[PDB]
Each structure stands twice: as C-alpha cells, then as structure tokens.
Amino acid sequence: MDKKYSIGLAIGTNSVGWAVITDEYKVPSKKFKVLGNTDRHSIKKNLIGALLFDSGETAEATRLKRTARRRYTRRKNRICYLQEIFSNEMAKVDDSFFHRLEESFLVEEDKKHERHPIFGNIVDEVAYHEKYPTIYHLRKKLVDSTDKADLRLIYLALAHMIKFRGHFLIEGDLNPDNSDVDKLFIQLVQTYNQLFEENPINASGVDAKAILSARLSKSRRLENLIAQLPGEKKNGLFGNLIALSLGLTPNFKSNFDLAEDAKLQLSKDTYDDDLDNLLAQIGDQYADLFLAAKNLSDAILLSDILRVNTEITKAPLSASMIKRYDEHHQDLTLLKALVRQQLPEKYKEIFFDQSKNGYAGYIDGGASQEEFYKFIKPILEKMDGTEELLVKLNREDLLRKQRTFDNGSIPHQIHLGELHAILRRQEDFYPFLKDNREKIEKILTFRIPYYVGPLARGNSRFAWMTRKSEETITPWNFEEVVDKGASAQSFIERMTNFDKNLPNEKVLPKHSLLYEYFTVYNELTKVKYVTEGMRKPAFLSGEQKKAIVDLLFKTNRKVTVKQLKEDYFKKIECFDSVEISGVEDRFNASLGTYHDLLKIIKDKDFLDNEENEDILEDIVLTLTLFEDREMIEERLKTYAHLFDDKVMKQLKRRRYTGWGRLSRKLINGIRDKQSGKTILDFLKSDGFANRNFMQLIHDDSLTFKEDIQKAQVSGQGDSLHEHIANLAGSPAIKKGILQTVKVVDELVKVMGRHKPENIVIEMARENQTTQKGQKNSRERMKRIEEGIKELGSQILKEHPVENTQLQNEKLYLYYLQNGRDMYVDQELDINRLSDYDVDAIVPQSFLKDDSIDNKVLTRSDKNRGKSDNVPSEEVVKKMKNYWRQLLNAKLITQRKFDNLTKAERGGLSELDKAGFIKRQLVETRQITKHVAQILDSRMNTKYDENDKLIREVKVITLKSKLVSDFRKDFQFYKVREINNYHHAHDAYLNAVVGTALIKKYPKLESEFVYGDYKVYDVRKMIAKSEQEIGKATAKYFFYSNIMNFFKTEITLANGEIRKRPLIETNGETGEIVWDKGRDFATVRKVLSMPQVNIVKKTEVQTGGFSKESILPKRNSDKLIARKKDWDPKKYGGFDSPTVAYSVLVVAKVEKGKSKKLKSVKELLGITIMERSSFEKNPIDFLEAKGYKEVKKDLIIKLPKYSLFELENGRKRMLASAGELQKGNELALPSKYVNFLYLASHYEKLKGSPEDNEQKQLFVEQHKHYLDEIIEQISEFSKRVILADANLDKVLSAYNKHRDKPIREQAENIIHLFTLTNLGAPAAFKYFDTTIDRKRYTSTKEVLDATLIHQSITGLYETRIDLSQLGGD
RNA sequence: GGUACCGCUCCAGUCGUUCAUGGUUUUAGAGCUAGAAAUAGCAAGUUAAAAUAAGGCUAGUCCGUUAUCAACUUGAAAAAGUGGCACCGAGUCGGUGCU
DNA sequence: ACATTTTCGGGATGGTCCTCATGAACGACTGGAGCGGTAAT
DNA sequence: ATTACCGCTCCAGTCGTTCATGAGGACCATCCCGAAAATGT
Ligand SMILES: [Mg+2]
Ligand SMILES: [Mg+2]
Ligand SMILES: [Mg+2]
C-alpha cells in the first residue's frame, strides 16, 4: 500500500542509527521468532536502533599503504637490475662466485659452501679494514685510482651506488664542480654593470656566499643581498636574477616591458629552449647573465651540501663523509680520556647502560640524537677541557651515525660523477666495462614518465602498455617491444577531465575554438539592430552572426558598437545610418586562442578554409593532452602542408593546460532525427529566443530526449557496489553509505512491503573550522579575538582591522598560537608566515581531523626524526599550562592538546570538551548533497508511468542545525562521550522533523545549500552589522526561523517559560499532526525505554594481513614465519598475524602423562592465510591442526564479534582468535547523566529562566548522585569481572577528592561511560589517581555460555545448542 | 506566490603519478690472565654483503593491506529469494488472541 | 594394598614493552565565498 | 501585474546554544589446584 510510515537515519563516522515512525501506533515494539534452540518464546525488540562498525584506515593512511608497496619494490628492483648486469659475468670468470651468493643464508647443516664475502679466503677477508675504514674510502680509492681492483670490490662499490642511488628530483645536467665559485658572483655584478652603465651595482667587498650560507628565509636572503649590494631593489632585474638562483620562479614580463608572461625556472630541460626564444628577441649580449646564473645555482648546491673543494680528490661526496667520520673517533677518544681522569666512578655507567640513552645504546641501538646530546651536555659543561666538545653539539658534528636519514637524501647527479670515474678508471683493466658503460649510465639516470608508466608482462586494469612480442620491456630496444604512443593514449583516455553526460567520453580543451565560438554566438543572439530602411529593432540572423565573427572577431579580440557601426554595417551590409541595441558599448565575449595562433604561426592560410577549424581543434586537443613533443610532431606531420620546419621546431615547448565542461559530440556530433540540425546549427540560426544549454537538452521539442533515455534513464545494475562506486574516498563515509542503503532497502521490505512517506538522513564530518570566505573565515576570527580579549590588549580599540586581511589558515595560526611555535618555543612573525613551514600533528596516519585544528605552524620539522619522543621536554613543562590557557580561551582544542600528552594517557575520545567551555560551529555538511542521490537511484527503480515524473520514494537529507531546539524541548543531553547509544535517538528525531516539514509547506524558504544571504530584503536595522562586527544574516538567527514556522516558544522573555498549547493545528488540511498530550510524553519515554536495538556489526576480518617487519622476539604457535622452513628463533616471522574468524570444533589433542584426548569443543583461529584452503577443503586443515575426527554437523563457525549469553545472567562477545570482549548493554537511570553534565556547566555560570534556575538548584541541592553512581558501578563489576577489585581504590579516591573542582573531575568522568560500549575496557587519569589497565583472556564458565548469531540489520537471532560441547 | 545554467577569483580538502634513504633482521668477524669450576678483571674494539605480507592468475624483470561472507531454500557453479499483525505494558523485554 | 605428603606441571591473571614513515616536481578534481550575469507576468 | 500570514530591534556588542566521538597482544612472574610415586600401617 501507498503510505503508512516514515523512517530516519543518522550516519556517523563508525555507526549508523535508524528509527521507524508510524501514524497508527506510538510504541515501536515488535516480536521475532527465535531460531535454533528457542530459549525464549518470541523475543521482542525496539524498532529504534543502531549499528556499530570499524572505520578503518582513512585518506593519508590508504595513500601510504599503496605507496609502501611500490616503495620497497623500486629499491628491490634497482638492486636486482645491477645484479643481473654483473652477476653472470662474475660467475663466468670466477667459478667460486655463484656458491657464495646462494649459500649466504641458513644454518651449517643445510649450508653447502663457506661465505668468503670479498676475497675467497678467511685469511685475506679481514685484511680489508686495515686500509678501508668505510665504503667511502674505497669510493675515493676507485675514483682516484691508478691501478686494478678485484671485480668483487668493483661490484661492491657499484652496488652501494645503486642501492644508495640517490634522488632524480630536478631535470637537466648539473655541473659537478666546486673549483672556483667566488668568481661567478663577481662576474654577474660586472656583466650587469657593463650591460647597464646607467646605474652600476657596487660589490663593496661584500661576501654574498656568507649571506646565502646562513640559515635565513628566501625573502631574507634576497633582502640582505639587496641591502649589502647597493644599486638595485628586491623587485628589480638584479633581485629577480638572484631569486632565480634561490630556486624561485621570477616573471621578467615587467622587467623587459613585455605584453606576455615571461616566467623562468631551472627545474626543466626546456629552460635552454626558452633561453633560445628569449635571446633571439633581446640579443646575444644578454646570454652571459642567464647562463652564469644557471651554473652558479649548480655551484651553490654542491657548496652547501658537500662543503668540500674539488681537485684535491675527484670524489668530494665520499670525502665529505670521511672527514667527519675520522673526527668522531678523535673527539670520543678525547672525551674518554677526560672521563677516566675526572669521573672514574661513573665511567662504566656513561658508556654502558642503555636506559639514559648512553654510548653503547646509541651505537648498537636506535637512540635519539637530542636525547644523546641532552645526557652528555651538562656533563661536558661541568668538566674541564671540553670547550671544543661543547661547540660540536651546536654544530651537530659530535658522533653522528653514518647510517641515518639526514645522510641519505643525496641527489642522483653527484652519485653519477663518482660512478663515471669508477667505470672510466677500470676501462684499461676490464674491457667489459667499455661495452657495459652505456647500459649502466642509462639505468643510473632512468626515470619513468606519466605517458609510459607500468611495463607489466601480464594483463590487468592498470597495464596501459601494448606489448608486441615475448621479449623485454626495458628501455633497451623499447620501441621494438612496446609502443609509448599506445600507453600515452590509454593513459590519457583513463586520466583526464571527462564528460558527465557521456560516461565513456571526454570534454574539449579550454582553448577550443568551438568553445570560444559558442560564447560569441550567445552574445550575438542577444543583439538587435536598426538600419536605414528597418523601422524597429530586429535580431541578428545566422549569416550576419557568421559575418561579424569573420570580420570583427577575427581582426580584434573584442567587439564594440563603434566597430559594428563604422566597419560591419557600412562595408558588408552598406548602411550609413544604423543602431545596435540589447547590449552596452562593448561585448563580454571574445576570441583568445585565435589571436595567440596568429602571433605564434604568423600566417593566414590556416584560417578561413572550411576544413581548417577542425584541423586546429585536433591540434589544440593534442597540445593540451600530451607533453610528449614527439607525439605533437606526429600530429603536425599529417597537416605538414600548413606548418614549415621553423614553426614545428618553435611549437616544441609545452602544453596548453585546462579543459571545458562539454565534449564536441553533444554540440555538433549529434543531429536531430527530424530536422537534421545539431545544437551548434540551432545556435547559428533558429526561431525566437533561447534557453540554457542543459534546458535545451531536456526540452521536449528536440529529439535528444531519446539519447537521455538510452544513457541516463537506464542507470546502474542490481548490485549495490555499482551504485556506491561514486562519492567519497573516506572508508568511514563509504561503509556508512554501504550499511545505510542496506538498512533502508530492508526496512521497506520488512514493513509489510509498504512504502515510506519520507526517508530522512543526516551525515556529518569531524569539522574543526569554517572554510575560507567571509561567510566562514570571518567567524573563525571570533575564536582568535576571544583569546586576544582574554589575554588583554588595547590594539582592538585603538585601530580597527579590515575583515579581508585574515581570510586564510596561515594568518589564523599566528594569532591562535601567538608569535611562537608549539615544539621549541621560538619566535614567529607576520612577515614570516608564508616564509616558514606548516606541519600536521599526525601526518600519514590512521585518522585525520577535518582541517585547521589538525595543523600547526612550526620553524623546522627535522626534530620529528620518525619517533614518538618530543625532544623539547623542558618546553612542554611550561607550555602545558599555556596550552590549557589556550583551551580555556578556546584557541586550541582538547584533542589537539591531548596529542601532546599521549605518553601519559594514550588514546580514548574526548572530542566535545567544547560542551563546557563554548560550542559555536555551524556545519555545512557538503557530503549530504549526493547521499540522497545514491539511495534515490536504487529506491525509485520503476518505470510504469507515462513520463508522469511521480516519485514513490522520497529521500530527504536533514541538517543538524535544526535539532538544537528539539534537544531543549525534550531535555536531551546527547554528547556521545557519555552515551554510545547516540544515533538511535538522533535517527528518531530526524524522522520526526523531516516528516513535520512536509505536512504543511514552510513559511520561510531559502536557496539551494548556500541559502540565506543570496536573496533577502534590504533592512537598515541589520545594516549596523557590517560596520561594527562584519556581515551577518539568518545563519546566526536560524533559531528564530524555527520559531516563525512552528511558534513553539517565546525566546524574548526570561523567568517563567510558556509554550504553544498541547492541542494545535499543524497540517495543510487543518489537522493535528503532533500531539503534546501523547507524542511529547512518548518521545521522552523512549529516551529511558528498556532494550534499544543496538549491535556491533557481524563480519570476518579481511585485508591488512601483516606489517612489513620481523619479530623474532615472539616464539608462540601464532607466529607466521617469513619463510616456511626457516627457524623463527633466528629469522622470525611477520609482525601482527591477522585471524579472519574462528571455528568451534571438538579437539583430538592429547593432554598430560596418560595422553588423554580433549573430547570437548575448542576455539581454532582461521587466519586470512590458511582460510584460502580451509573454505575449499576443511577436512585436511582440521586434521593438520589436531581436530582429525569431526563430522560436518559438529562444525560451528564463529565470525568477528560473535555474541554469547550466559545462563548465569551475563553477556559476552568474541574478538577474533578466541579473545574475550566485554559485551552486555547498560541499564542505568537517566537522573545520573543529566546531573554530571550540568554540574560542570554551572561551576562558573549562573541561571535566569525557569528551567536554568531549577537546573542550577538541582545540582546544588542534590550532590548525593556521585555516591549513588559508585554504588551502581559496584553492581556492574559483578556482571563482567565478578570481583570489584579496583572499585575500592575508586571509592577511596571519591572520598579523598571531594574538595577538588567539580568541572576538572567531570572532564575525565566520561571514561566510566564505557559501560554502554560492547568493548573499550579503558584506563585513564581521573584527578591525582590513574586507573590500572586490564584485558579479558577467556570465560571459565564455558558450559553456561550460549552462542548467538544475529543479523547485521538487527532483526532475527539464532541460538546454537549446548549438547555438542562435550567435556571429560 | 513564481527561475535555470553558471562566469571570474581565492582558499581548503580529497589525492594520484615518480624517485630515495634509514630503522630492523641475518652471516662472515684469528684475545689474555687468575680459579678444578661457576666467576671476575685487563690488554682490546677501526668492517662488508644479502633481505623484508601468506599465496597465486595470465604461473610473473607480475599482482595482492577488500566487501557481502547468520539461520533457510533453490542452483553442478557463478548466482538469486523469503523474514505477520491487532493489542497492553516497560530495571537486564513479557502477555492475551488469531495466523 | 590404600591414604596422605610430596614435587612438578598447567591455567587464570596482571605488569611492562612492542609497533614502516618522509615529500617535492608535476597535475587535477568539488565546493564555497565575494566580486558578479540575465529575466517574466 | 506582484514581492514575509511569520524576524514589529537595544543607554549596545554581549557569551552562549548542537555535533563527528575510546590501541591490544606477547612474554615473564606469580598463586592455586591436580596426578603419580614413596612411605607408614
Ligand atoms: Mg549527525
Ligand atoms: Mg612537517
Ligand atoms: Mg548522531
């Protein structure tokens, strides 16, 4: 039947709630038949409920997981690449090479050959370190070599240089020399002075290198050079030439008075090509400055990162490492002698003992630099003869470990320098190197471009390449085995802007000539004209529109009325007296691409010919899509009759970026099957007036409605996956939608297959801020301003600040944190906010908060060092109280603060701390825009109507901004921190409001999403806003819109509270929709109503199998070895083995001295690994695990979050492999929840209206609730742990801390509401007492536990029999 | 009562392609004196190489950090489908009656 | 030949330690706010 | 041929209303209970 009920849902990050409301009854109570045992007659449940689920790894964590797979694969392949080059050659000349490489692993008993790494004999193996203290000395030896080295030490050096290959970040050949840098600074100044004799720049003996070497910002380095070298300004020619060498992108358009942009950069191979175009126009005499600037940048890079001069060695990189390496042993020997003489007593302790981060732990362990320096620093300060040792601490030159990240970030080019020498020196000793050098230099330089990508032998979705035959895919003989044109085309067809009306096609480039013609013809259509014979204004015809485009738009970019009157009408149409109307003095439309083409080609033969426009569109499409300049050449070859050799060489520079929103097919590729005309044909000439482009597509007058029916009306298939394959990358939103559509689909089916009137859905994010804009940013300012006014200042009253200044995050971070960082407490300033770096609190991590409160403005992040130990402990000690002052002024959040105290308490959500100090944040919830569309797509899959457009199922998305007044009316305090049954009541209220809104049409409407400010009437009494505080509208007064439409209460009066009468008309037919004598009482009755239908989702664990590390520290049976036959005691197994689910089977395992069979059912964990054969054949699996004698009907599978109910009155849940989870819902009176929230609230706040007056008096008169709460808790311990254990400590603490602040105790009490959750046995700090951490191994009372299998939808429940359990 | 398609700009989030290092595991790594011996002290310390998700298609110079995955019936199998209401009440969800 | 004392072994339990992440060159999307376009009956 | 049925304002710019909402497992130290053997009667 048509309409009987409505449903509502509330979608969170890791939970979905729902509720069903029906006109015929007020009690959401319904029965189901018990499956299996039938322990209860017919179990009833509440229709209001919620589903809990695990959210998984979000955005940047998913990013890191795919990156991590490709990450080591690259390093592994590079090691394998050079191995394939030399291994076979070494095996051919040395028979003993092969066996040593193969027998390098495993125990003696399985080993067939001795290791002998370098020489081939134990006697000679330990002769190496006598001349070579490190790999870097062998590198110097081979680079400066005059003699022959063994192929094992040659491969040893070459293998180091491909494992330690270095980064190919910047394109082009950089100068590997540091011989005479000083000269380059003098020659640039003198060359400028010779070319510009009007105002010479004076060097004045200034050392420019000293300014650049110092750790200053790029802006400050430029400024200091301009201040010390007089003759030119920071924004002048010389300043922009310095900026280029600083690695910036200057634009010399304003410098050479150019009509077009002239940006230069040193990061691209085409820079030399751009200089050829530039010098062709400004002349040869300016070449020296740009070539010297390029070479100086190369010289400065090596000077800064190596700090070693050339010619004393041809290996300055290896030499740079050696100097410090030797100094480490000399400084350590010195300090060791000083400690022996001054501190005999602590001599063993200082060097041997890991616990304080000493020398032994530092060398053999992973001890932090800052902790190591911290320990030895006051020791060196107290000791005599340590002056030089104290300097090395500040320089960071004291005992730095050779292998560390800071010594790893080396570029590919300086590595090629030394490698070219390693190969060249040995060419007259090994002739094989002369032939292999070509292949070696290529793989050392090699990098995969976008248009080639994956070179996979097999067939798969992401295999873009077409392979010719079974040979190779290596760059060697590349064109003979694969075609980069085929991979470039398949790459572009998959990755580019796509047409949203054509699923398999793509849009035109933004430089399309057709795209530009479309806008010009629209403006020409608006034009009316008057002539010498024509009496009244008439519109332009198609031939006249074409004539104006052919004449005026092809001779000047923009057209004006004078041009039409003096040129077009007098020349083409031959009228002296004419007039143009419909437009002003000029048009908005213009041709941009057309005149750009004339300037580059400089001809007219490619213009007016009918076929040439299609030729130019194909060429611009190619120029936008492909950087590959040989692909551009091949496009130009088919049209070579229009393009000579010079223009084709000039075009080889760069891409025409950006696309339009329409493809060509729609515009002039689809013809009307009755008139024969395209949309472009109708645009040029048709009937009176026009409509919007999408309106003309939908228009019933054209035959394009058929194309809509064949494409759009068809829709997606039966499978849900196909409908949720769009919207959101978040696994939290994805799973929320996945379960939401399933719940809605099932609710409509089980409700007698009747259709709901409304489906009301909410979906939100962890919004930490408003977005950029004066409708958003302007309010973010208030969060800063309150902190400023709390601290105190006269600045805000003395001088007003314009609202357009503070619009972005970087300007907000400065005033939120003040002029100081949050890690080392060093100075920040306004002029340095775009010059200093910004960090994330938890980058590339499991969960990420929505925007500005997840980030922090810092000075340098090098202190992070991939560790969880803040090196600025002493800073945290004073800043912790400062950070609490910031939370009190609401400048930083509770989660932001707690991430800096993690070591003391771990995790556990405290997110809505704002609730007692200020909650002000109106959320947009942009995700909700397409949620209804995905559901609507499945729900209204029916076409039994003659284009009636009548929907049967209406899905409505709701904003939570309307719920606030309903929380007040029904006295709801719903912070999830004190209630994990949160979504159940939200979804109910959502169904109430969304249904309420449609029963009588709204009195005050607003525009789509944006709404309020867009359309409103001018009122002077809201104009005082902008002048005083800034723009404001109904977004602030949204509560008054609710009062206008419903008239529920009067908010203009304090004291006695009176509201709208109990029995009032609410429907469009004059009927009563909601009744306060029945409905209102029922809503508040549901709040405390027993047995709400809430469950943790049933599944089994898939994905995330293990972490890429080995833990030989573990040795239990659950450890999965890295290789099957390798001993876990030596070579270990993989970090964190993942169990998909468990199976309950009677054991065949023998116990004790008599070897008795365990004839009782036991838990066997099924791993994601072993599952792969278990599901296919469980018999062989069970026999291998010790469960040999078993029958099919005796095997019971236990999925993830399986439930148990004990006959002794307890409820429990299964984790994964057999571990015990808490379970059991919380039955507790509502009088405790309201008290604790309000008790903290009314600490420093006083009441006034009737309700607030009684709430304050309630907390003040009734302080006995804390004593009743510990009494209720002592009765829940008995249902979980049995013994009270630590509640004697908690009761003692509750009697002890009665003289402590009400708020500060209520701030952490939220951790005791874990009783509502089915897991989370949390440990936390209360006030001065920190509670013990416990976990549940298993249930002793096995035979009393009944196995429960429930549906994910929360409907039917299966109870499994106890007669099969056994026991002997 | 009674609108549709968007231009220009700035900022943010979602992210993708590409490349490198280190943490860490493992093997080779020639010592002296006292004491039955456990055990202790001193001489003495300078390095290199290999490797890092089970498992497997298309059996790889390749892919893999995932969802439905409970009872029940039909289907070789892939795959698909069914889940009662009137009527009263609410401290660990019960009852009258029909189906 | 049987019961008690005796030592060694297993399970339930809690305390402490363990954890593969960094980012710029090059390049694109949705999406919102403020400056706006164009109007009929 | 028209633009809120309702938001009609204060000796002054004020803080505040609601929400997305919680790391556990392995190894080692330890106490209590149970089985087979040696000894006494
Ligand atoms: Mg919500
Ligand atoms: Mg950072
Ligand atoms: Mg909610």
Numbering used by the authors: 1 to 1368
Sentences copied from the publication:
In brief, the sgRNA-guided Cas9 first binds to the target DNA by interacting with its protospacer adjacent motif (PAM); then, the two nuclease domains (HNH and RuvC) catalyze the splitting of the scissile bonds in two DNA strands, respectively. Also, it is known that the HNH domain cuts the 20-mer target sequence complementary to sgRNA, and the RuvC domain cleaves the non-target sequence. Here we use cryo-electron microscopy (cryo-EM) to determine the structure of Streptococcus pyogenes Cas9 (SpCas9) in the DNA cleavage-activating state.
As a result, a 5.2 Å cryo-EM structure of SpCas9 in complex with sgRNA and target DNA is reported. Compared with two known HNH states of SpCas9, this structure captures a distinct conformational state in which the HNH domain is nearest to the DNA cleavage site. Thus, the EM density-based atomic model consists of the experimental SpCas9 mutant (D10A, H840A), sgRNA, and 41 base pairs of the target DNA. Since we did not observe significant density for the PAM distal end, we determine an atomic model for the SpCas9–sgRNA–DNA ternary complex, which includes only two base pairs of the PAM distal end linking to target/non-target sequence. Compared to the HNH-state 1, the HNH domain as a whole rotates about 170° around an axis, roughly, which is located vertically at the middle of a β-sheet segment (β6, residues 757–764) and an α-helix (α45, residues 925–940). To facilitate the movement, the linker L2 (residues 906–923) undergoes a helix-to-loop conformational change, similar to that of the Staphylococcus aureus Cas9 (SaCas9). Through the rotation, with respect to the HNH states 1 and 2, the HNH active site is shifted toward the cleavage site by about 25 and 13 Å, respectively, so that the distance between the Cα atom of residue 840 and the scissile P reduces from ~32 (state 1) and ~19 Å (state 2) to ~10 Å (state 3), respectively. Because of the close contact of the HNH domain with the PI domain, about 7 bases of the 20-mer non-target sequence are enclosed in the channel formed by the HNH, RuvC and PI domains (from bases −7 to −1), including the scissile bond of the non-target strand. The EM-based atomic model indicates that this segment interacts with bases 14–15 of the non-target strand, about 11 bases downstream PAM.
